[PDB]
Design an enzyme around this catalytic site. Structure first.
Site, PDB file in Angstrom:
ATOM      1  N   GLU A 166       0.701  -1.067   0.529  1.00 40.70           N
ATOM      2  CA  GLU A 166      -0.079   0.082  -0.461  1.00 40.70           C
ATOM      3  C   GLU A 166       0.923   1.161   0.183  1.00 40.70           C
ATOM      4  O   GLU A 166       0.325   2.809  -0.856  1.00 40.70           O
ATOM      5  CB  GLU A 166      -1.070  -0.421   1.099  1.00 40.70           C
ATOM      6  N   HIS A 196       1.877   2.458  -3.648  1.00 41.46           N
ATOM      7  CA  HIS A 196       0.568   2.848  -3.651  1.00 41.46           C
ATOM      8  C   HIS A 196       0.668   4.251  -3.876  1.00 41.46           C
ATOM      9  O   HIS A 196       0.806   5.367  -4.580  1.00 41.46           O
ATOM     10  CB  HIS A 196      -0.564   2.179  -3.802  1.00 41.46           C
TER      11      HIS A 196
HETATM   12  N1  LIG Z   1      -2.867  -9.750  -0.080  1.00 47.14           N
HETATM   13  C1  LIG Z   1      -3.755  -9.095  -0.164  1.00 47.14           C
HETATM   14  N2  LIG Z   1      -4.779  -9.653  -0.703  1.00 47.14           N
HETATM   15  N3  LIG Z   1      -4.066  -8.084  -0.217  1.00 47.14           N
HETATM   16  C2  LIG Z   1      -5.429  -6.998  -0.122  1.00 47.14           C
HETATM   17  C3  LIG Z   1      -5.515  -5.639  -0.322  1.00 47.14           C
HETATM   18  C4  LIG Z   1      -5.956  -6.337  -2.314  1.00 47.14           C
HETATM   19  C5  LIG Z   1      -6.255  -4.716  -3.090  1.00 47.14           C
HETATM   20  N4  LIG Z   1      -6.693  -4.943  -4.144  1.00 47.14           N
HETATM   21  C6  LIG Z   1      -5.028  -3.645  -3.077  1.00 47.14           C
HETATM   22  O1  LIG Z   1      -3.625  -4.830  -3.952  1.00 47.14           O
HETATM   23  N5  LIG Z   1      -4.850  -2.630  -2.409  1.00 47.14           N
HETATM   24  O2  LIG Z   1      -3.690  -2.048  -3.002  1.00 47.14           O
HETATM   25 ZN   LIG Z   2      -3.133  -2.738  -4.223  1.00 47.38          ZN
END
Ligand SMILES: N=C(N)NCCC[C@H](N)C(=O)NO
Ligand SMILES: [Zn+2]
Length: 411
Positions: free
Chosen positions: A219, A222
């Site tokens: 995260e 991102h």
């Molecule tokens: N390892 C996992 N299962 N991650 C959970 C979040 C998934 C979400 N699509 C995502 O990647 N968000 O950034």
């Molecule tokens: Zn992601």
């Protein structure tokens, strides 16, 4: 020492690093207690019912692999444990060289001051702030880069989101905007080992669990993209070929880039160049905006000071006249660092932990955990503790062997 302060949920607000705060464009919410764990980084130990209007409830809908529990993160003790878990994962990420670099980039990534309609004027964009209520009752407007908050209805739907302007596309025009990461250090995912001929045979047993530190780092990656406004439009996808019984499963470029490794390569050379030139062009525009700026509004800081903050963020060049420009190789290094060096895959390698080799290796289950106790997880080893016997063949991540640190919930 990423967080130079021991924070307990029950500590009295002081209006500086512990305080009741109000979030932008959140309509009329009740103030929530928040903690400032590092410069430009706050943590709200609450379930997220503020960032989105249509998601101000923790009610289990008709559903769709998800996990719901309206009572999760409702007690002070839980919130206190949440705060310690997040703080601990940050220390874990920051303890590595890669993580130290990522978090440094994030902190230097102040959302651009492009909220003015007057081009000779630098102005902040209100949604990149929070109001910090003081002990007296007044509120102070504070700019911030990152906010870590608890999940909404679907507890395991972690994501990095932000408010975004009415006309501007802040996460894609180079400006950037305050990032709100829905996350929980109290849960993790189980994945199955894709038995490949050269893979270690001494692998304990069945399911392995994802290190929550890799998840948060994911995260954070991102966030870095979004803070620098070079995030890939979520519309962009690759039509992955899974089954023959499937005439197609879309996966976004932003995700494939973030995961890195072999996955990132699905973004062909033509697309890579396209995104890079585009963002190069966008930085050049930020430079021009700074060059035309003669005044700053919402006064406190000096004009030169803010110009310098962005010269540092974007790594701009300044000649003797004081005019900013974008240096091609500096841009190349910055861009490459944010999109190719900071990846989930490179973190899996620094941490030396087992993890899915690709999205294609979808997680089988959802486990309940608690990394706060050092007897369970440490900054340096995660679940695979040294002196312990868990520091062998990733026993720490084996949900069969380390059965005491994992409690199955779904799937
Ligand atoms: N390892 C996992 N299962 N991650 C959970 C979040 C998934 C979400 N699509 C995502 O990647 N968000 O950034
Ligand atoms: Zn992601």
């Amino acid at each position: 020492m990423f967080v130079n302060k021991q924070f307990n949920y029950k500590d009295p607000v002081n209006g500086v690093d512990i305080a009741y705060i109000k979030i932008p464009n959140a309509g009329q919410m009740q103030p929530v207690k928040a903690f400032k764990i590092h410069n430009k980084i706050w943590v709200i130990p609450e379930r997220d019912t503020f960032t989105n209007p249509e998601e101000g409830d923790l009610n289990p809908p008709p559903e769709a692999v998800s996990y719901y529990d309206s009572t999760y993160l409702s007690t002070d003790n839980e919130k206190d444990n949440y705060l310690k878990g997040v703080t601990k994962l940050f220390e874990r990420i920051y303890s590595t060289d890669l993580g130290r670099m990522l978090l440094t980039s994030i902190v230097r990534g102040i959302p651009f001051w492009g909220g003015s309609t007057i081009d000779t004027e630098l102005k902040v964009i209100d949604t990149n702030c929070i109001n910090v209520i003081q002990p007296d009752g007044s509120y102070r407007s504070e700019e911030l880069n990152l906010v870590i908050i608890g999940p909404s209805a679907d507890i395991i739907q972690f994501e990095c989101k932000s408010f975004g302007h009415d006309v501007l596309n802040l996460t894609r025009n180079g400006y950037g905007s305050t990032q709100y990461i829905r996350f929980s250090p109290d849960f993790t995912f189980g994945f199955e080992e894709s038995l490949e001929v050269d893979t270690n045979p001494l692998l304990g047993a069945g399911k392995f669990a994802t290190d929550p530190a890799v998840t948060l780092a994911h995260e954070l990656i991102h966030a870095e993209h979004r803070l620098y406004g070079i995030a890939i439009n979520p519309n962009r996808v690759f039509k992955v070929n899974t089954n023959a019984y499937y005439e197609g499963l879309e996966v976004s470029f932003e995700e494939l880039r973030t995961f890195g490794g072999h996955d990132a390569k699905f973004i062909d050379s033509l697309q890579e160049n396209e995104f890079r030139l585009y963002y190069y062009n966008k930085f050049k525009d930020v430079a021009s905006t700074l060059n035309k700026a003669k005044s700053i509004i919402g006064t406190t800081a000096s004009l030169q000071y803010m110009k310098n903050v962005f010269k540092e963020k974007y790594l701009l060049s300044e000649d003797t006249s004081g005019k900013f420009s974008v240096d091609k190789l500096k841009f190349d290094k910055l861009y490459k660092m944010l999109t190719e060096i900071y990846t989930e895959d490179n973190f899996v390698n620094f941490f030396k932990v087992i993890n899915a080799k690709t999205f294609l290796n979808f997680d089988k289950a959802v486990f309940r955990i608690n990394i706060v106790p050092d007897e369970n997880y440490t900054i340096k080893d995660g679940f695979n503790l040294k002196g312990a016997n868990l520091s062998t063949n990733f026993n720490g991540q084996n949900t069969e062997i380390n059965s005491r640190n994992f409690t199955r919930l779904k799937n």
